[PDB]
Amino acid sequence: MASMKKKGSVVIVGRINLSGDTAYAQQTRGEEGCQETSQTGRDKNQVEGEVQIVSTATQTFLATSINGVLWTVYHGAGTRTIASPKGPVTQMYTNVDKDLVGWQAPQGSRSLTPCTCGSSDLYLVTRHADVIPVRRRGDSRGSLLSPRPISYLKGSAGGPLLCPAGHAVGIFKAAVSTRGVAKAVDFIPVESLETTMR
Ligand SMILES: CC(C)(C)OC(=O)N[C@H]1CCCCC/C=C\[C@@H]2C[C@@]2(C(=O)NS(=O)(=O)C2CC2)NC(=O)[C@@H]2C[C@@H](OC(=O)n3cc4cccc(F)c4c3)CN2C1=O
Ligand SMILES: [Zn+2]
């Protein structure tokens, strides 16, 4: 018992910058700082933007602010706290059945607005700042207009699908692939986030 370890916090290590005319990834913390911050849960870096790049000791993925909550996938974060300026912050939402977790959005972050357009022309934002057109095919699936190897999508769970007007439509959860080629993506619809918030 005396030697049982604690898991680290999720740490924000960068962002996908969507503020201008060009989407691009920025790193804000390197590996040594990430490891230290995961242990203390104390991250004094300034946070900006809607889409964060996040890491644990073993994985890296995305997290997206919508309605004042920073959302990501359970299969990346588990039940972990997130690092913040005053120490670890406990999840305010956890739903393994939806593959969804959320923490209060970091000070400095900006939130996407939930889409009410009812549009099926979507855009997936990856951890490499690719903006991939996706045609909505149901409540929680969309097809890639141009299929890609799953290598391209790995590490982007937790990122957003957006409508033409830049509203949040969903959170990327899983790739639908055959022979290593992603033809479609599954996502957690924003309506499901809004229900979880109640
Ligand atoms: C569901 C279906 C149709 C059978 O498909 C698939 O299972 N396909 C696979 C294809 C894997 C190849 C890589 C694909 C590339 C990118 C994938 C987006 C991604 C990712 O980037 N993760 S990550 O590297 O950032 C990672 C660090 C965070 N997610 C995954 O890998 C997830 C994770 C795992 O699924 C889950 O644990 N759960 C738990 C769930 C609970 C409820 C509901 C769910 F659906 C759940 C899905 C399998 N996954 C797939 O996608
Ligand atoms: Zn919209």
Numbering used by the authors: 983 to 1180
Lines from the paper:
The HCV NS3/4A protease – a chymotrypsin-like serine protease – is a prime therapeutic target that cleaves four known sites along the virally encoded polyprotein. The NS3/4A protease also hydrolyzes two human proteins, TRIF and MAVS, which are part of the innate immune system, thereby confounding the innate immune response to viral infection. In this study, we report that four chemically representative protease inhibitors – telaprevir, danoprevir, vaniprevir and MK-5172 – exhibit distinct susceptibilities to the protease variants R155K, A156T and D168A. To elucidate the underlying mechanism by which chemically diverse inhibitors bind to the wild-type protease and drug-resistant variants, crystal structures were determined for 16 inhibitor-protease complexes. These complexes include wild-type protease and resistant variants R155K, D168A and A156T each bound to telaprevir, danoprevir, vaniprevir and MK-5172, with resolutions ranging from 1.10–2.50 Å; S139A protease variants were used except for telaprevir, which requires covalent bond formation with the serine 139 for efficient binding.
Relative to the wild type, R155K caused large reductions in potency for danoprevir and vaniprevir, but MK-5172 remained highly active (R155K IC50 = 0.55 nM). For both danoprevir and vaniprevir, the R155K mutation disrupted the favorable cation-π stacking interactions with the P2 isoindoline moieties, causing significant reductions in drug potencies. In danoprevir, the P2 isoindoline moiety shifted in response to R155K and D168A mutations, making extensive interactions with the catalytic D81. Danoprevir's isoindoline moiety bound in two conformations in the wild-type complex, but adopted a single conformation in mutant complexes. R155K and D168A mutations confer danoprevir and vaniprevir resistance by disrupting favorable cation-π stacking interactions with R155.
